[PDB]
Coordinates of C-alpha atoms in Angstrom, one line a residue:
Chain W
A59 CA 0.0 0.0 0.0
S60 CA 2.9 2.3 0.8
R61 CA 4.1 2.0 -2.8
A62 CA 4.7 5.4 -4.5
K63 CA 1.4 7.1 -5.6
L64 CA 1.7 7.0 -9.4
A65 CA 2.0 10.4 -11.1
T66 CA -1.3 11.5 -12.7
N67 CA -2.2 10.3 -16.2
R68 CA 0.2 7.3 -16.5
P69 CA -1.0 4.8 -19.2
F70 CA -1.2 2.2 -16.5
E71 CA -2.8 1.7 -13.1
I72 CA -1.2 0.2 -10.0
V73 CA -3.1 -3.0 -9.3
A74 CA -1.8 -5.1 -6.4
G75 CA 1.1 -2.8 -6.4
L76 CA 2.1 -3.4 -10.0
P77 CA 1.4 -1.4 -13.2
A78 CA -1.6 -3.0 -15.1
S79 CA -4.4 -2.0 -17.4
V80 CA -7.7 -3.7 -18.4
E81 CA -6.7 -3.6 -22.1
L82 CA -3.7 -5.4 -23.6
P83 CA -0.6 -3.2 -23.2
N84 CA 0.4 -1.3 -26.4
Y85 CA 4.1 -0.6 -25.5
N86 CA 5.0 0.3 -29.1
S87 CA 2.3 3.1 -29.2
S88 CA 2.8 4.3 -25.7
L89 CA 6.5 4.0 -24.8
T90 CA 9.3 6.1 -26.3
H91 CA 12.1 4.7 -24.1
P92 CA 10.8 1.3 -22.9
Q93 CA 13.1 -0.2 -20.3
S94 CA 13.8 -3.9 -21.0
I95 CA 11.9 -6.5 -19.0
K96 CA 15.3 -7.1 -17.5
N97 CA 15.4 -3.5 -16.6
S98 CA 11.8 -3.4 -15.4
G99 CA 11.5 -6.8 -13.7
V100 CA 7.7 -6.3 -13.5
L101 CA 7.3 -9.9 -14.8
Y102 CA 9.6 -11.1 -12.1
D103 CA 7.7 -9.2 -9.4
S104 CA 4.5 -10.6 -10.8
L105 CA 5.7 -14.2 -10.7
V106 CA 7.1 -14.0 -7.2
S107 CA 3.9 -12.3 -6.0
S108 CA 1.8 -14.9 -7.7
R109 CA 3.7 -17.9 -6.1
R110 CA 3.8 -16.3 -2.7
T111 CA 0.1 -15.5 -2.8
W112 CA -0.7 -19.0 -3.9
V113 CA 1.2 -20.1 -0.8
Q114 CA -0.7 -17.7 1.4
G115 CA -3.9 -16.7 -0.3
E116 CA -7.6 -17.1 0.7
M117 CA -8.4 -20.0 -1.7
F118 CA -8.8 -22.5 1.2
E119 CA -10.0 -21.7 4.7
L120 CA -7.1 -21.7 7.1
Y121 CA -7.4 -23.9 10.2
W122 CA -4.0 -24.4 11.8
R123 CA -0.9 -22.2 11.9
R124 CA 2.4 -23.0 13.7
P125 CA 2.5 -20.8 16.8
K126 CA 4.9 -17.9 16.5
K127 CA 7.3 -18.4 19.4
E138 CA 8.4 -24.5 30.3
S139 CA 5.6 -23.2 28.1
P140 CA 3.2 -26.2 27.6
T141 CA 2.4 -24.9 24.1
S142 CA 5.3 -27.2 22.9
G143 CA 3.4 -30.2 24.2
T144 CA 0.5 -29.3 21.9
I145 CA 2.5 -30.0 18.7
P146 CA 2.3 -33.8 19.1
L147 CA -1.4 -33.5 20.0
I148 CA -2.0 -31.6 16.8
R149 CA 0.1 -34.2 14.9
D150 CA -2.0 -37.0 16.3
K151 CA -5.4 -35.3 15.8
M152 CA -4.6 -35.7 12.0
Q153 CA -3.7 -38.9 10.2
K154 CA -0.8 -39.1 7.7
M155 CA -1.4 -39.6 4.0
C156 CA 0.6 -39.7 0.8
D157 CA 2.2 -37.0 -1.4
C158 CA 0.4 -35.4 -4.3
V159 CA 0.9 -32.6 -6.8
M160 CA -1.2 -29.5 -7.4
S161 CA -1.2 -26.9 -10.1
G162 CA -2.0 -23.2 -9.5
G163 CA -2.5 -21.3 -12.7
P164 CA 0.9 -21.4 -14.4
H165 CA 2.4 -22.5 -11.1
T166 CA 2.6 -25.9 -9.5
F167 CA 2.9 -27.1 -5.9
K168 CA 3.3 -30.4 -4.0
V169 CA 1.3 -31.6 -1.0
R170 CA 1.1 -34.4 1.5
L171 CA -2.4 -35.4 2.6
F172 CA -3.8 -35.3 6.2
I173 CA -7.1 -36.5 7.6
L174 CA -9.1 -34.5 10.2
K175 CA -10.4 -37.2 12.6
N176 CA -14.2 -37.0 12.9
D177 CA -15.0 -38.5 16.3
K178 CA -18.6 -39.2 15.4
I179 CA -17.4 -41.5 12.6
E180 CA -15.3 -43.4 15.2
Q181 CA -18.2 -43.8 17.6
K182 CA -20.6 -44.9 14.8
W183 CA -18.0 -47.3 13.6
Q184 CA -17.7 -48.9 17.0
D185 CA -21.5 -49.1 17.2
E186 CA -21.6 -50.7 13.7
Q187 CA -19.0 -53.3 14.6
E188 CA -21.1 -54.0 17.7
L189 CA -24.2 -54.5 15.6
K190 CA -22.4 -56.7 13.0
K191 CA -20.9 -58.9 15.8
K192 CA -24.4 -59.3 17.4
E193 CA -25.9 -60.1 14.0
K194 CA -23.3 -62.7 13.3
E195 CA -23.8 -64.2 16.7
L196 CA -27.6 -64.3 16.2
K197 CA -27.4 -65.9 12.8
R198 CA -25.0 -68.6 14.0
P424 CA 9.3 -69.6 0.3
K425 CA 6.2 -67.7 1.3
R426 CA 3.8 -66.9 -1.5
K427 CA 4.9 -63.5 -2.7
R428 CA 1.9 -63.4 -5.1
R429 CA -0.3 -63.2 -2.0
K430 CA 1.8 -60.2 -0.7
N431 CA 1.4 -58.5 -4.1
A432 CA -2.4 -59.2 -4.0
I433 CA -2.6 -57.7 -0.5
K434 CA -0.6 -54.6 -1.7
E435 CA -3.0 -54.1 -4.6
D436 CA -6.0 -54.6 -2.4
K437 CA -4.8 -52.1 0.1
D438 CA -4.1 -49.7 -2.8
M439 CA -7.6 -49.9 -4.3
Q440 CA -9.7 -51.3 -1.4
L441 CA -9.4 -49.9 2.1
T442 CA -7.3 -50.5 5.2
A443 CA -9.0 -50.2 8.6
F444 CA -8.4 -46.4 9.0
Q445 CA -9.7 -46.0 5.4
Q446 CA -12.5 -48.4 6.1
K447 CA -13.8 -46.2 8.9
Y448 CA -13.0 -42.9 7.1
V449 CA -14.7 -43.7 3.8
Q450 CA -17.5 -41.1 4.1
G451 CA -17.6 -37.9 6.1
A452 CA -13.9 -37.9 6.6
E453 CA -12.3 -34.5 6.9
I454 CA -9.3 -33.6 4.7
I455 CA -6.6 -31.0 5.5
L456 CA -4.2 -29.4 3.0
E457 CA -0.6 -28.5 3.7
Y458 CA 2.2 -27.0 1.5
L459 CA 5.3 -29.1 1.4
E460 CA 7.3 -25.9 0.7
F461 CA 5.6 -24.1 3.6
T462 CA 4.4 -26.5 6.3
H463 CA 3.4 -23.6 8.6
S464 CA -0.3 -23.3 7.4
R465 CA -3.1 -25.8 7.0
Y466 CA -6.3 -25.1 5.1
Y467 CA -9.7 -26.8 4.6
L468 CA -10.6 -28.5 1.4
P469 CA -13.6 -26.6 0.0
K470 CA -16.8 -28.4 0.7
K471 CA -18.7 -26.0 -1.6
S472 CA -16.7 -27.3 -4.5
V473 CA -17.2 -29.3 -7.7
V474 CA -14.9 -32.3 -7.9
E475 CA -14.2 -34.3 -11.1
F476 CA -12.0 -37.4 -10.9
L477 CA -10.4 -38.1 -14.3
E478 CA -9.8 -41.9 -14.4
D479 CA -7.8 -41.7 -17.6
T480 CA -5.2 -39.1 -16.5
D481 CA -5.5 -39.5 -12.7
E482 CA -6.1 -35.8 -12.5
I483 CA -8.8 -34.1 -10.3
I484 CA -10.2 -30.7 -11.2
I485 CA -11.8 -28.6 -8.4
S486 CA -14.0 -25.6 -9.1
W487 CA -15.5 -23.0 -6.6
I488 CA -16.8 -19.5 -6.5
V489 CA -15.1 -17.0 -4.1
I490 CA -16.4 -13.7 -2.8
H491 CA -13.9 -11.0 -1.9
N492 CA -16.2 -9.2 0.5
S493 CA -17.4 -12.4 2.2
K494 CA -16.7 -10.9 5.6
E495 CA -19.1 -8.1 4.9
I496 CA -21.8 -10.7 3.9
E497 CA -21.1 -12.8 7.0
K498 CA -21.3 -9.8 9.3
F499 CA -24.6 -8.6 7.7
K500 CA -25.8 -12.2 8.0
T501 CA -25.1 -12.1 11.8
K502 CA -26.9 -8.8 12.1
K503 CA -30.0 -10.3 10.3
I504 CA -29.8 -13.4 12.5
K505 CA -29.8 -11.1 15.6
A506 CA -32.8 -9.2 14.1
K507 CA -34.8 -12.4 13.6
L508 CA -33.9 -13.6 17.1
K509 CA -35.0 -10.3 18.6
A510 CA -38.3 -10.5 16.7
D511 CA -38.9 -14.1 17.8
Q512 CA -38.2 -13.0 21.4
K513 CA -40.6 -10.1 21.1
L514 CA -43.3 -12.4 19.9
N515 CA -42.6 -15.0 22.6
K516 CA -42.9 -12.2 25.2
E517 CA -46.5 -12.0 24.2
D518 CA -47.4 -15.7 23.9
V529 CA -33.5 -22.4 10.2
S530 CA -31.4 -22.6 7.0
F531 CA -30.7 -18.9 6.9
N532 CA -28.9 -18.4 3.6
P533 CA -27.3 -14.9 3.2
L534 CA -26.9 -15.4 -0.6
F535 CA -30.7 -15.7 -1.1
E536 CA -31.5 -12.7 1.1
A537 CA -32.7 -9.6 -0.8
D538 CA -30.7 -7.2 1.3
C539 CA -27.4 -9.0 1.0
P540 CA -24.6 -6.6 -0.1
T541 CA -23.2 -7.0 -3.6
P542 CA -20.7 -9.9 -3.6
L543 CA -17.5 -9.0 -5.4
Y544 CA -17.0 -12.6 -6.6
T545 CA -14.5 -14.7 -8.6
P546 CA -15.0 -18.2 -10.0
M547 CA -12.0 -20.4 -9.5
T548 CA -10.9 -23.7 -10.9
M549 CA -7.8 -25.9 -10.0
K550 CA -6.5 -29.3 -11.1
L551 CA -5.0 -31.9 -8.7
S552 CA -2.8 -34.7 -10.0
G553 CA -1.2 -37.7 -8.3
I554 CA -4.1 -39.0 -6.0
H555 CA -4.6 -42.8 -5.8
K556 CA -7.9 -44.7 -6.4
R557 CA -8.6 -45.4 -2.7
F558 CA -8.3 -41.7 -1.8
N559 CA -10.7 -40.7 -4.5
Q560 CA -13.7 -42.4 -2.8
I561 CA -12.9 -40.6 0.5
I562 CA -12.6 -37.3 -1.4
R563 CA -15.7 -38.0 -3.6
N564 CA -17.7 -38.8 -0.4
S565 CA -16.4 -35.8 1.4
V566 CA -18.0 -33.1 -0.7
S567 CA -21.5 -31.7 -0.4
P568 CA -24.6 -32.6 -2.3
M569 CA -24.1 -31.2 -5.8
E570 CA -27.5 -29.8 -6.8
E571 CA -27.8 -27.6 -3.6
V572 CA -24.4 -25.9 -4.1
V573 CA -25.2 -25.6 -7.9
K574 CA -28.3 -23.7 -7.1
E575 CA -26.4 -21.6 -4.5
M576 CA -23.8 -20.8 -7.1
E577 CA -26.4 -19.8 -9.7
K578 CA -27.9 -17.4 -7.2
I579 CA -24.3 -16.1 -6.5
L580 CA -23.8 -15.7 -10.2
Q581 CA -26.9 -13.6 -10.6
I582 CA -26.2 -11.4 -7.6
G583 CA -22.4 -11.4 -7.8
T584 CA -20.1 -8.8 -9.2
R585 CA -17.4 -10.6 -11.3
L586 CA -13.8 -9.5 -10.9
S587 CA -12.6 -7.7 -14.0
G588 CA -9.8 -9.2 -16.1
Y589 CA -6.8 -6.9 -16.8
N590 CA -3.4 -6.9 -18.4
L591 CA 0.0 -6.1 -16.8
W592 CA 2.3 -3.7 -18.5
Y593 CA 5.7 -5.4 -17.9
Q594 CA 7.6 -2.6 -19.7
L595 CA 8.0 0.9 -18.1
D596 CA 9.5 4.2 -19.3
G597 CA 12.9 4.8 -17.7
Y598 CA 12.2 8.6 -17.5
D599 CA 8.5 9.1 -16.7
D600 CA 8.5 6.0 -14.4
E601 CA 11.9 6.2 -12.9
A602 CA 10.5 6.4 -9.3
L603 CA 8.3 3.4 -9.9
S604 CA 11.0 1.4 -11.5
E605 CA 13.5 2.0 -8.7
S606 CA 10.8 1.4 -6.1
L607 CA 10.1 -2.0 -7.6
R608 CA 13.8 -2.8 -7.8
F609 CA 14.3 -1.9 -4.1
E610 CA 11.3 -4.0 -3.0
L611 CA 12.6 -7.0 -5.1
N612 CA 16.0 -6.6 -3.5
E613 CA 14.4 -6.7 0.0
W614 CA 12.3 -9.7 -1.0
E615 CA 15.4 -11.6 -2.2
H616 CA 17.4 -10.6 0.9
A617 CA 14.7 -12.1 3.1
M618 CA 14.3 -15.2 0.9
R619 CA 17.8 -16.5 1.6
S620 CA 17.2 -16.5 5.3
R621 CA 14.2 -18.8 4.8
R622 CA 16.4 -21.7 3.7
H623 CA 19.1 -20.5 6.2
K624 CA 16.5 -21.2 8.9
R625 CA 16.2 -24.9 7.8
Chain L
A30 CA -18.1 -2.2 -18.1
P31 CA -17.4 -0.7 -14.7
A32 CA -13.9 -1.4 -13.5
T33 CA -13.6 -3.1 -10.1
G34 CA -10.9 -0.7 -9.0
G35 CA -8.9 -3.8 -8.0
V36 CA -9.7 -5.2 -4.6
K37 CA -10.4 -2.7 -1.8
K38 CA -8.7 -3.2 1.6
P39 CA -9.5 -1.9 5.1
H40 CA -7.5 1.3 5.3
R41 CA -5.6 1.4 8.7
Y42 CA -4.0 4.7 9.4
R43 CA -0.8 4.1 11.4
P44 CA -1.5 4.6 15.1
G45 CA -1.0 8.2 16.3
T46 CA -1.4 9.8 12.9
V47 CA -5.1 10.6 13.2
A48 CA -4.3 11.5 16.7
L49 CA -2.1 14.3 15.2
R50 CA -4.9 15.2 12.9
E51 CA -7.1 15.6 16.0
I52 CA -4.3 17.6 17.7
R53 CA -4.3 20.1 14.8
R54 CA -8.0 20.2 14.4
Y55 CA -8.9 20.8 18.0
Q56 CA -6.0 23.3 18.4
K57 CA -7.3 25.5 15.6
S58 CA -10.9 25.5 17.1
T59 CA -11.7 28.0 19.8
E60 CA -15.0 26.9 21.3
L61 CA -15.5 25.5 24.8
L62 CA -14.6 21.8 24.6
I63 CA -16.1 20.6 27.9
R64 CA -19.9 19.9 27.7
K65 CA -21.7 22.8 29.2
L66 CA -24.4 21.0 31.2
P67 CA -22.1 18.6 33.2
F68 CA -19.6 21.3 34.0
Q69 CA -22.6 23.3 35.3
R70 CA -23.4 20.2 37.4
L71 CA -19.9 20.2 38.9
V72 CA -19.9 23.9 39.7
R73 CA -23.5 23.7 41.1
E74 CA -22.4 20.8 43.3
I75 CA -19.2 22.5 44.6
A76 CA -21.0 25.8 45.3
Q77 CA -23.9 23.9 47.0
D78 CA -21.4 22.2 49.2
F79 CA -19.7 25.5 50.0
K80 CA -22.9 27.6 50.5
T81 CA -26.6 26.9 50.8
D82 CA -29.2 28.4 48.4
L83 CA -26.7 30.0 46.0
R84 CA -27.6 31.2 42.6
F85 CA -25.5 31.8 39.5
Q86 CA -25.4 34.2 36.6
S87 CA -25.2 32.3 33.4
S88 CA -22.3 34.5 32.4
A89 CA -20.5 33.6 35.6
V90 CA -20.8 29.9 34.8
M91 CA -19.5 30.5 31.3
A92 CA -16.6 32.5 32.6
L93 CA -15.8 29.7 35.0
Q94 CA -15.8 27.2 32.2
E95 CA -13.5 29.5 30.1
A96 CA -11.1 30.0 33.0
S97 CA -11.0 26.2 33.7
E98 CA -10.2 25.4 30.1
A99 CA -7.4 28.0 30.0
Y100 CA -5.8 26.7 33.2
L101 CA -6.1 23.0 32.1
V102 CA -4.6 23.7 28.7
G103 CA -1.7 25.5 30.4
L104 CA -1.2 22.6 32.8
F105 CA -1.4 20.0 29.9
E106 CA 1.3 21.8 27.9
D107 CA 3.5 22.0 31.0
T108 CA 3.0 18.3 31.5
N109 CA 3.9 17.7 27.8
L110 CA 7.2 19.5 28.2
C111 CA 7.9 17.5 31.4
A112 CA 7.2 14.2 29.7
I113 CA 9.4 15.3 26.8
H114 CA 12.2 16.0 29.2
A115 CA 11.7 12.5 30.7
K116 CA 12.2 11.2 27.1
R117 CA 8.7 9.6 27.0
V118 CA 5.7 10.4 24.8
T119 CA 3.3 8.9 27.3
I120 CA 2.4 11.6 29.9
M121 CA 2.2 10.2 33.4
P122 CA 0.8 11.6 36.6
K123 CA 4.3 12.3 37.9
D124 CA 4.7 14.7 35.0
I125 CA 1.7 16.7 36.1
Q126 CA 3.0 16.7 39.7
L127 CA 6.4 18.0 38.6
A128 CA 4.7 20.7 36.6
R129 CA 2.7 21.7 39.7
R130 CA 5.8 21.8 41.9
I131 CA 7.8 23.9 39.4
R132 CA 4.8 26.1 39.1
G133 CA 4.6 26.1 42.9
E134 CA 0.9 25.1 43.3
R135 CA 2.0 22.3 45.6
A136 CA 5.7 23.1 46.5
Chain G
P697 CA 19.5 -9.0 -10.3
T698 CA 20.8 -11.6 -12.7
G699 CA 21.9 -15.2 -12.8
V700 CA 20.7 -18.5 -11.3
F701 CA 22.9 -18.5 -8.1
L702 CA 22.5 -16.9 -4.7
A703 CA 25.4 -14.9 -3.1
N704 CA 26.3 -18.0 -1.0
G705 CA 26.5 -20.3 -4.1
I706 CA 23.2 -22.1 -3.6
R707 CA 21.0 -22.5 -6.6
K708 CA 17.8 -20.5 -6.9
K709 CA 14.4 -22.3 -6.8
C710 CA 12.1 -21.9 -9.8
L711 CA 9.1 -19.6 -9.2
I712 CA 7.1 -21.7 -11.6
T713 CA 7.9 -25.3 -10.5
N714 CA 10.0 -25.0 -7.3
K715 CA 12.8 -26.9 -9.0
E716 CA 16.4 -25.8 -8.7
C717 CA 17.1 -23.2 -11.4
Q718 CA 19.4 -24.4 -14.2
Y719 CA 19.3 -21.5 -16.7
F720 CA 18.7 -17.7 -16.9
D721 CA 16.8 -15.8 -19.5
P722 CA 19.0 -12.9 -20.6
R723 CA 16.2 -10.9 -22.3
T724 CA 13.7 -10.7 -19.4
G725 CA 16.1 -11.6 -16.6
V726 CA 13.8 -14.4 -15.2
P727 CA 15.8 -17.5 -14.3
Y728 CA 14.0 -20.8 -15.1
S729 CA 14.5 -24.4 -14.1
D730 CA 13.3 -26.2 -17.2
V731 CA 12.2 -25.9 -20.8
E732 CA 8.6 -26.2 -19.6
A733 CA 9.1 -23.2 -17.3
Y734 CA 10.6 -21.1 -20.1
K735 CA 7.7 -22.0 -22.4
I736 CA 5.1 -21.1 -19.7
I737 CA 6.8 -17.7 -19.2
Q738 CA 6.9 -17.1 -22.9
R739 CA 3.2 -18.0 -23.2
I740 CA 2.6 -15.4 -20.4
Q741 CA 4.4 -13.1 -22.8
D742 CA 3.1 -13.0 -26.4
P743 CA -0.5 -12.6 -25.2
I744 CA -1.7 -12.7 -28.8
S745 CA -0.5 -16.1 -29.9
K746 CA -0.1 -15.2 -33.6
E747 CA -1.0 -18.4 -35.3
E748 CA -2.4 -16.2 -38.1
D762 CA -10.5 -22.6 -32.2
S763 CA -8.0 -19.8 -31.7
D764 CA -9.9 -18.6 -28.7
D765 CA -9.4 -22.0 -27.0
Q766 CA -5.7 -21.5 -26.7
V767 CA -4.3 -21.1 -23.2
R768 CA -4.8 -17.4 -22.2
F769 CA -3.3 -16.5 -18.8
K770 CA -4.8 -13.4 -17.2
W771 CA -3.8 -11.7 -14.0
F772 CA -6.4 -11.4 -11.2
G773 CA -5.9 -9.1 -8.3
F774 CA -6.4 -10.7 -4.8
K775 CA -6.1 -9.2 -1.3
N776 CA -2.4 -8.2 -1.0
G777 CA -1.3 -9.8 -4.2
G778 CA -2.2 -11.2 -7.6
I779 CA -2.4 -14.5 -9.5
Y780 CA -2.3 -15.6 -13.1
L781 CA -5.5 -17.4 -14.3
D782 CA -6.1 -19.1 -17.7
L783 CA -9.5 -18.1 -19.0
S784 CA -9.4 -21.1 -21.3
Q785 CA -9.1 -23.5 -18.3
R786 CA -12.0 -25.9 -18.6
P787 CA -13.7 -25.8 -15.1
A788 CA -14.7 -28.9 -13.4
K789 CA -17.6 -30.9 -15.0
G790 CA -20.9 -29.5 -13.8
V791 CA -20.3 -25.7 -13.9
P792 CA -23.5 -23.8 -14.8
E793 CA -24.0 -21.6 -17.8
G794 CA -22.3 -18.3 -17.2
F795 CA -19.7 -19.9 -14.9
Chain Y
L23 CA -26.1 15.9 42.4
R24 CA -23.7 13.0 42.7
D25 CA -20.6 11.5 41.0
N26 CA -20.3 14.7 38.9
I27 CA -16.5 14.4 39.2
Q28 CA -17.0 11.6 36.7
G29 CA -19.3 13.7 34.6
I30 CA -16.2 15.4 33.0
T31 CA -15.8 12.0 31.2
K32 CA -12.5 10.8 29.7
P33 CA -13.2 12.2 26.1
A34 CA -13.3 15.8 27.4
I35 CA -9.9 15.4 29.1
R36 CA -8.8 13.8 25.8
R37 CA -9.9 16.8 23.7
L38 CA -8.4 19.3 26.1
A39 CA -5.1 17.5 26.1
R40 CA -5.4 17.3 22.3
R41 CA -5.4 21.1 22.4
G42 CA -2.3 20.9 24.4
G43 CA -0.7 18.9 21.6
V44 CA 0.0 15.7 23.6
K45 CA 0.5 12.8 21.1
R46 CA 0.4 10.0 23.8
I47 CA -1.7 9.7 27.0
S48 CA -2.0 7.4 30.0
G49 CA -5.1 6.2 31.7
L50 CA -4.1 7.5 35.1
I51 CA -4.0 11.0 33.8
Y52 CA -7.8 11.4 33.9
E53 CA -8.0 11.0 37.7
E54 CA -5.1 13.4 38.4
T55 CA -6.6 15.9 36.0
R56 CA -10.0 15.6 37.8
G57 CA -8.3 16.2 41.2
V58 CA -6.4 19.2 39.9
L59 CA -9.6 20.6 38.4
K60 CA -11.5 20.0 41.7
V61 CA -9.0 21.9 43.8
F62 CA -8.8 24.7 41.3
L63 CA -12.6 25.0 41.1
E64 CA -12.9 24.8 44.9
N65 CA -10.5 27.8 45.4
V66 CA -12.0 29.9 42.6
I67 CA -15.6 29.2 43.8
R68 CA -14.8 30.0 47.4
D69 CA -13.2 33.3 46.4
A70 CA -16.2 34.2 44.2
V71 CA -18.8 33.3 46.8
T72 CA -17.1 35.3 49.4
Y73 CA -16.9 38.2 47.0
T74 CA -20.7 37.8 46.5
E75 CA -21.6 37.5 50.2
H76 CA -20.0 40.8 50.9
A77 CA -22.6 42.7 48.8
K78 CA -25.6 41.3 50.8
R79 CA -26.2 39.2 47.7
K80 CA -27.6 35.9 46.5
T81 CA -26.6 35.6 42.8
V82 CA -22.9 35.1 41.9
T83 CA -22.3 37.5 39.0
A84 CA -19.6 37.4 36.4
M85 CA -18.0 40.4 38.2
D86 CA -17.5 38.2 41.3
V87 CA -15.9 35.4 39.2
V88 CA -13.6 37.7 37.3
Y89 CA -12.4 39.7 40.3
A90 CA -11.9 36.5 42.3
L91 CA -9.7 35.2 39.5
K92 CA -7.9 38.5 39.6
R93 CA -7.2 38.0 43.3
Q94 CA -5.7 34.6 42.3
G95 CA -3.6 36.5 39.8
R96 CA -5.3 34.8 36.8
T97 CA -6.5 37.8 34.7
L98 CA -9.4 37.3 32.4
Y99 CA -10.6 39.7 29.7
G100 CA -13.8 40.0 27.7
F101 CA -16.6 39.6 30.2
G102 CA -17.6 43.3 30.8
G103 CA -14.5 44.4 32.7

């Protein structure tokens, strides 16, 4: 935000701190002394920003962050480790960028209790009704790869999935329940799509206000003698919204069932999305001007250069901390 | 057709900056800053404690408010200089006490 | 800044793939790990892919997000089931 | 009338100190400020009331206030002097 306030009438606007315009840049018409992309680095800045944002953005709801340091808070690390189960390593693409992930399950205790009750019922039903062969080891391996081991047999449906970045293990995010999931059997690729609202906090707070108003009205009526959906409500503020889509690759057959079971009934979210699409304000698509004039944009160029220098200076320490 | 203007963000003025804005704004203004009615309540109570069945001129109460504000601003600026000398921006009661002593109201 | 190495001699990590950078683009100054990385960057450049179904070609656009921006391909086929107007 | 020492509020002390140009304030300041104001008012009011009672009087006039302040050495102009 503290970036230099661009001089009036520049042929670009500063979007996310960088020079961009809605229309495709016409350098040849607009620039007399264009600095090279090497000189500008705008492309570099954009790429670093993109990757970092993908590491830290709002795409998935955050749920756990490593606490910024005989404090017992150390003892909670193994507890948080055990509250999730450990699962195998998978690749993700974010726009032009790609990332890698290991998978972790969030232990739904109701599924554990119901599994114990189901085993009780099945046992009671059964009681009421009443060298070594390596090929068998290969069969067991394949069965455990496409059928389910005990932890997978309990967590088939309603299991909870946590995402973590293998290049940034500090943050954990929820897999979107309000998402469309397609499992490509031929390519082993999974595409996830969801709509995201930039002022969602505004909508949630107005939703809370409406809930309070309805509760007050019900209390007033009671003094004499609910699937509240903010997106349906006529007084909901305009969502600034974006539709998003992402592809996963590298997930194995057994995990697909867990994932496929985990997401919400499709028609309901489809109708919700259609409402969002009527009421939403779509994010406008714009084009970055990677080339800047060395004379009119000298301040902007140097500012970008300085910020890049600081970013790189910090980035070395990140691995030096490992 | 309408540009989004990017994504807006909650603007958070750095702490103390709008405080300086208030400093300047209130310093330019010249009206009485203490609410008239509660100050009248204080002076009525103090006089009633001191003497029974008193009355006031409205102008007298206004003059008392003006004099109070003048004294208080003088005290506050003295306290500011004291705190500055301490090399602290947070004024503390001891700064006022020191101001009083150097003034001699409690020496 | 130029080159693929840090001041301590450790190789830079690709912004696109997170692989260790092998080569450096002299024109733009963006170091890249692999041919795929370079090709992706070039496709980010050359917005009008002058082949002259043309609209179906990968078209990366930049979207501004809270505190940063990301590149999105408007030709990305969204997951099966997206409504009309998605 | 009760608790009117509180009636000054914090925000009034805030605004007055703002006139004084103080950039940073402490919570304890308010109580001390109230005490100082209390003793100042008590002295000024006692002087004014005795100035009034001399004249076989019942209404404290602006003359009594201004001359009481003059006796405290605090000189005030603009109220009919």
